[PDB]
């Protein structure tokens, strides 16, 4: 639900075209009088309580708790015979078929997500072979997240990047009361 903001709209008892006057003779016929030929009771008028306004549901909810849950899902992938953590995401070959055949040979899973330490320092051969990996993916440092944490069958973390995630969760561990927004400088922020 993080960012989706739907746009579907409607019209109200004054939005869609037409309607100011009494529509027909209110009592001469045996029919029903109304207020308009533009209220929501007739054939063409209003969708009276439909979703008005392009709505949004952003939720900057408890971020330390989000961190702990992200850790939790990482732990789930750890115990589930999925956390195959590699030393470095180098590609010994250039063919994506090499990755596919190794993955079937490793019995890793039906889907793979490998993440590295730095995007610019991600190996060119690995991404180049990965570009045709129609179901596998490669990811940078901050991208380890929840829907991602279910996304593949298994995740391949880079070792120094694994330490980076550890340090991140460690800074997530025991965060004092924030009295300033943590984007600016601090005593030991980096």
């Amino acid at each position: 639900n993080f960012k989706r903001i739907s746009y579907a709209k409607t019209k109200t008892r004054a939005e869609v075209r037409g309607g100011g006057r009494k529509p027909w003779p209110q009592k001469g016929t045996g029919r029903a009088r109304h207020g308009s030929i533009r209220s929501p009771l007739w054939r063409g008028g209003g969708v009276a309580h439909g979703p008005r306004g392009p709505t949004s549901y952003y939720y900057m909810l408890p971020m330390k708790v989000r961190a702990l849950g992200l850790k939790v899902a990482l732990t789930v992938k750890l115990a589930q015979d999925d956390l195959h953590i590699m030393d470095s995401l180098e590609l010994p070959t250039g063919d994506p078929q090499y990755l596919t055949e190794l993955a079937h040979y490793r019995r890793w899973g039906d889907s793979v997500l490998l993440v590295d330490l730095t995007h610019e320092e991600m190996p060119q051969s690995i991404v180049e072979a990965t570009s045709r990996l129609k179901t596998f993916n490669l990811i940078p440092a901050v991208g380890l997240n929840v829907h991602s944490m279910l996304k593949h069958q298994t995740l391949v973390l880079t070792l120094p990047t694994v330490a980076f995630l550890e340090d991140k969760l460690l800074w997530q561990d025991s965060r004092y009361r924030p009295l300033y927004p943590f984007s600016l400088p601090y005593s030991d922020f980096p």
């Binding site: 990811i139 940078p140 991208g143």
Partner: protein, 99 residues
Amino acid sequence: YRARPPPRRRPGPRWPDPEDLLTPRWQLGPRYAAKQFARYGAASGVVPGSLWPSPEQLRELEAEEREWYPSLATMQESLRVKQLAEEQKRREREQHIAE
């Protein structure tokens, strides 16, 4: 495949185009480039003349102090006058009650 790398910060503090008609006044004024200096040092900023206040503004600050700050001696004299008046009023009330 692999997505584009995630968002980075802006390339230091950027001054805006004063010709641009779209810019809000909050980030293009006198203290705004001061905020830019406070962001990117003098390393990206301008000469630090914006840091010190203006001489006309200096006289304005002096006027603000003169209409907004007394001296401690004046306050002490006012307190002494108030205490003397309170003691005289108390003595007069006691004399009126005694009579």
